[PDB]
Design a protein around this ligand. Structure first.
Ligand SMILES: O=C(O)CCNc1nc(C2CCC2)cc(N2CCCc3ccccc32)n1
Lengths: 9, 208
């Protein structure tokens, strides 16, 4: 879940 | 501390049928991340837990929003793109029955009781802080945050609508309907992905 994990940061 | 005013601020800060549904869902997934970051203490959870909560609840979180958005729409759903879904195109998507459930179990009941935006935001925060989400590092920490949300919700309801003593429980008791509607919507979205009707290379595809 690279996209979700990134947007959260 | 979990002030309903910040939960309202989060709401106000962000707010072919299958192709229209999928495009609007992809658009709102990005919005949903911005919304969750504005819910007090969500971004203080371990990153992996934030991932787990949004993966567990994004379907119900989007349904709750488009349902409330549609309370002044005549027999249909206003998507976040500005396009509508009416009964015909719902059947064309093979989702006629679930569409009817959204209207009778969510939109019409939100309209009837005039659910306001603080209430919607708090219901959505409860959904977000789902302590049954699988693989959380400390499920009870998420339960603790859920309990602070519904404590604040109840106090808000009792202050603003004291002539409706049953209103807090009435709000909470739309969540089983949201849960089963969210399960059925996801089963169709998975089907759309399996047959190749979903835009490829999207945030939406990762969520599925
Ligand atoms: O536009 C927004 O606010 C968010 C994106 N729309 C949007 N999202 C979803 C999310 C819920 C998981 C996919 C579903 C959805 N529908 C529209 C009408 C009823 C229905 C029945 C079955 C399957 C999907 C749907 N529609």
């Amino acid at each position: 879940h690279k996209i979700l994990h990134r947007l959260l940061q | 501390d979990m002030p309903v005013e910040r939960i309202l601020e989060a709401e106000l800060a962000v707010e072919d049928p299958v192709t229209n549904i999928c495009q609007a869902a992809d658009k709102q997934l990005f919005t949903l991340v911005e919304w969750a970051k504005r819910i007090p203490h969500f971004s203080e959870l371990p990153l992996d837990d934030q991932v787990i909560l949004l993966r567990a609840g994004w379907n119900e979180l989007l349904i709750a929003s488009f349902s409330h958005r549609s309370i002044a729409v005549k027999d249909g759903i206003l998507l976040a793109t500005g396009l509508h879904v009416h009964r015909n195109s719902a059947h064309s998507a093979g989702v006629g029955a679930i569409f009817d459930r959204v209207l009778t179990e969510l939109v019409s009941k939100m309209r009837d009781m005039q659910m306001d935006k603080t209430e919607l935001g708090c219901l959505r925060a409860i959904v977000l802080f789902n302590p049954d989400s699988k693989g959380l590092s400390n499920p009870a920490e998420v339960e603790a945050l859920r309990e602070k949300v519904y404590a604040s919700l109840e106090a808000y309801c009792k202050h603003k609508y004291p002539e409706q003593p049953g209103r807090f429980a009435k709000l909470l008791l739309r969540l089983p309907a949201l849960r089963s509607i969210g399960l059925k919507c996801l089963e169709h979205l998975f089907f759309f992905k399996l047959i190749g009707d979903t835009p490829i290379d999207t945030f939406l595809m990762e969520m599925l």
